[PDB]
Design a protein around this ligand. Structure first.
Ligand code: HEM
Ligand code: HEM
Ligand code: CYN
Ligand code: CYN
Ligand code: MG
Ligand code: MG
Lengths: 299, 298
C-alpha cells in the first residue's frame, strides 16, 4: 500500500544510484531488502533534517522469481532502442538513495551493501549532485515541466490499485556529455537542440523548433493527454573525467517511458533526438519498485 | 594576501586536481592569474558558499617560475619508509573548498578552462565531510586541528621574506580497507588511533601504544607542537575505492616531514598502526604562493 520513500521527494540535492547483478540464489534478496528498508527508517530517524528517501527495485528476471509471475505486467528487460543508439545494460537490482545530504546518502549506500553482501555484484555506483540554478551540465535548466507536488507526482508515478498498488516502474540511463562538442555549437543551435532558451529557460514554440528538438521528442500526448513521468535525474562526474546526466524516471506505466525512448532513438518516425550531437547514453535498464508492504511480504 | 583556500574551516566539500605540465612553464603564469580572478568572481556570485581555492606548484616548476628565489624547503616528495609511503610528485595542485559541492564543480571547470591543454590531469578527487565530521573509519577527524583564523594563519602562512603569505602543501590519498577495520574490536581500533571511537576522547600518551596515530603525529620539539593545518576529507564510492584524501598546509615543510618520517618508520623504526587497515597510494609536496606573488608571475 505504502510507496517507497525515494519515489516522490522533490528538490533533493544529492543521490546515489547502485546497479547490481545477482551473484547467488535470488532468495538472498528477500531478507536483504527487508533489512535495507529497516536501515532506511533508522537513518531517517537519526537524520530527520536530511529528508532521506530510498528505493529498492528489481529487474525483470529477478522480479518474476520474487513475485511468482504475479503483476508487474509491463515489466521486461530493457531493449536496445534505435537498433543500438540506446544501449541496454539490464541488471537485477537498483538501489536509489536521495536526500539533502550526500554524507547521509553515503552511510545509507554502505548499509545497502552490508545488507545485500556478496549476493550482488555492483556494476555501477553513481553519485548525483544538483548543479547551480538546477541546471544540467550542458547549462540548460532541468526540472521545469517535471510533475510538481506530492498529489500530481503520486498520480504520475504510483500504481493506483491491484496487486502492485503503491509500486512504480523505474528507468535509469547514464549519459556521458561531451561538453567540448556542445561548446562548438552556437547558443541559437543549442536552444533549437533542446527546445528551450538557455539563459531564461523559455520554451520555444513547437512549430518554431525542429521535430528533433528534445522537447519535440519527449513532450508526447495521446489524444491531448500528456505521457507524463516523474524524473529524479541529476548531474554526475568529475570536471576532468567522465561527466553527464544520470537519467532516472518513475512512472505508474512503463508505456509512457518507452514511448519517449522510441521517439528519442528513431523507432517511431525515423528521427532522433538532437541531443545525440553532444551526449550519449551508455547504460540502460528497467526495474520494478514494489510498495513497502510488498517488500515486507517477500519472506 | 594569502590564497583563499588555505584558512577556511568546516568546509563541507572539496575538489583536488593534481596535474603535470605538458606545455611551456610560461603557460602556467597567465592561467594562474585567470584562475585566481575566476575564484574572486565565484566568491562574489556565491557568497554563502564561503568558497576558497589554492593553486600550488611542484618543485621543478616552482623553481622555474620563481627563478630559484625562496621556497627554501621545497623539494620533490620522496618516498618515506623506503616505499611504505609512495611518491607521485606532480607539477600543479588545485584545491577548491566550500560549503557547496556544486559551486566547487563550477570552479573546477573554470580551473580546467584556464589551464587548458597546458596540463595533464593525473588525479581529480571530490572530498565530502561525512556524518559527525568522522573519517570513514568512524573516528572523528579534526579535533586537534588548529582552530580560528589567527592560529591557522600562525601555523600555515609564511610570515616574512619573499614568500610572505605563502604556504607549503602536502597531499596524499589513502585507500581504506573497512573490512579489515571491521575485523578489529573497537578497543583495538581505539589503541590504533589513540582516541576513543564514539566519544572521541584522547587516550593518555602513556596508556596507548607508541605506534598509535596520535603517538606518531602529535610531535613536540622542546615542548612546542609541530602543528599543521589539515583540510583532509573522505572520498570515494561505497562499493569501490574509498578513504581519506589527506591534505595539509604549513608555513614549514619541516613539520609535515617530521610527521611522515615518524608514521612511516624512518625516525624510530616503528610504523603507524593505521597501516593495518589503510594505505597511502599518492604523495606530493607543493608550494602555494601568496596572491601578490601570483599577480607578479612575469
Ligand atoms: C542527456 C540526457 C538528457 C538531458 C540533458 C535532458 C535535458 C532536458 C531539459 C533541459 C529539459 C527541459 C526542462 C524540463 O522541463 O525539465 C528536459 C525535459 C524533459 N526530458 Fe529530458 N533530458 C535528457 C534525457 C531525457 C530522457 C532519456 C528522457 C525520457 C526517456 C527525458 C524526458 C524528458 C521529459 C518528459 C521532459 C519534459 C518535456 C516537457 O513536457 O516539456 N529526458 N530534458
Ligand atoms: C588514513 C589517513 C589518516 C587518518 C584516517 C587519520 C585520522 C586522524 C584522526 C582520527 C585524528 C584524531 C582527531 C584529530 O585531532 O583530528 C587525527 C589526528 C591527526 N592527524 Fe591524522 N589521519 C590520517 C593521516 C594523517 C597523516 C598522513 C598526517 C600527517 C602527515 C596526519 C596528521 C594528524 C595530526 C597532526 C593530527 C593531530 C594529532 C594531535 O595533535 O592530537 N594524519 N588523524
Ligand atoms: C530530462 N531530464
Ligand atoms: C588526519 N586527518
Ligand atoms: Mg509541454
Ligand atoms: Mg596533543
Amino acid at each position: 500500500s505504502q510507496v517507497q520513500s525515494g519515489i516522490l521527494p522533490e528538490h533533493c540535492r544529492a543521490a546515489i544510484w547502485i546497479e547490481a547483478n545477482l551473484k547467488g540464489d535470488v532468495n538472498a534478496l528477500r531478507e536483504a531488502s527487508k533489512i535495507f528498508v529497516d536501515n532506511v527508517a533508522t537513518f531517517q530517524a537519526k537524520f530527520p533534517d536530511a529528508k532521506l528517501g530510498a528505493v529498492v527495485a528489481f529487474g525483470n528476471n529477478v522480479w518474476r522469481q520474487l513475485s511468482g509471475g504475479e503483476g508487474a505486467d509491463e515489466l521486461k528487460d530493457f531493449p536496445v532502442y534505435g537498433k543500438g543508439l540506446a544501449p541496454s545494460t539490464q541488471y537485477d537490482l537498483l538501489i536509489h538513495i536521495l536526500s539533502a545530504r550526500h554524507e547521509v546518502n553515503f552511510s545509507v549506500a554502505q548499509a545497502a551493501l552490508a545488507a545485500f553482501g556478496d549476493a550482488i555484484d555492483v556494476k555501477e555506483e553513481i553519485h548525483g549532485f544538483r548543479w547551480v540554478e538546477e541546471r544540467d551540465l550542458s547549462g540548460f535548466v532541468d526540472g521545469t515541466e517535471n510533475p510538481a507536488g506530492e498529489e500530481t507526482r503520486r498520480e504520475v508515478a504510483v500504481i493506483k490499485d491491484g496487486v502492485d498498488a503503491g509500486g512504480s516502474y523505474v528507468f535509469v540511463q547514464r549519459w556521458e556529455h561531451n561538453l567540448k562538442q556542445l561548446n562548438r555549437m552556437s547558443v541559437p543551435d543549442q536552444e533549437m537542440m533542446i527546445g528551450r532558451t538557455k539563459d531564461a529557460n523559455e520554451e520555444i514554440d513547437g512549430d518554431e523548433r525542429p521535430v528533433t528538438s528534445h522537447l519535440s521528442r519527449v513532450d508526447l500526448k495521446e489524444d491531448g493527454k500528456g505521457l507524463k513521468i516523474v524524473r529524479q535525474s541529476l548531474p554526475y562526474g568529475t570536471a576532468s573525467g567522465t561527466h553527464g546526466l544520470y537519467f532516472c524516471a518513475y512512472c505508474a506505466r512503463l508505456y509512457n517511458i518507452e514511448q519517449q525512448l522510441l521517439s528519442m532513438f528513431g523507432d517511431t518516425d525515423g528521427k532522433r533526438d538532437a541531443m545525440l550531437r553532444f551526449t550519449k547514453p551508455v547504460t540502460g535498464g528497467y526495474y520494478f519498485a514494489p510498495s513497502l508492504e510488498r517488500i515486507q511480504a517477500l519472506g
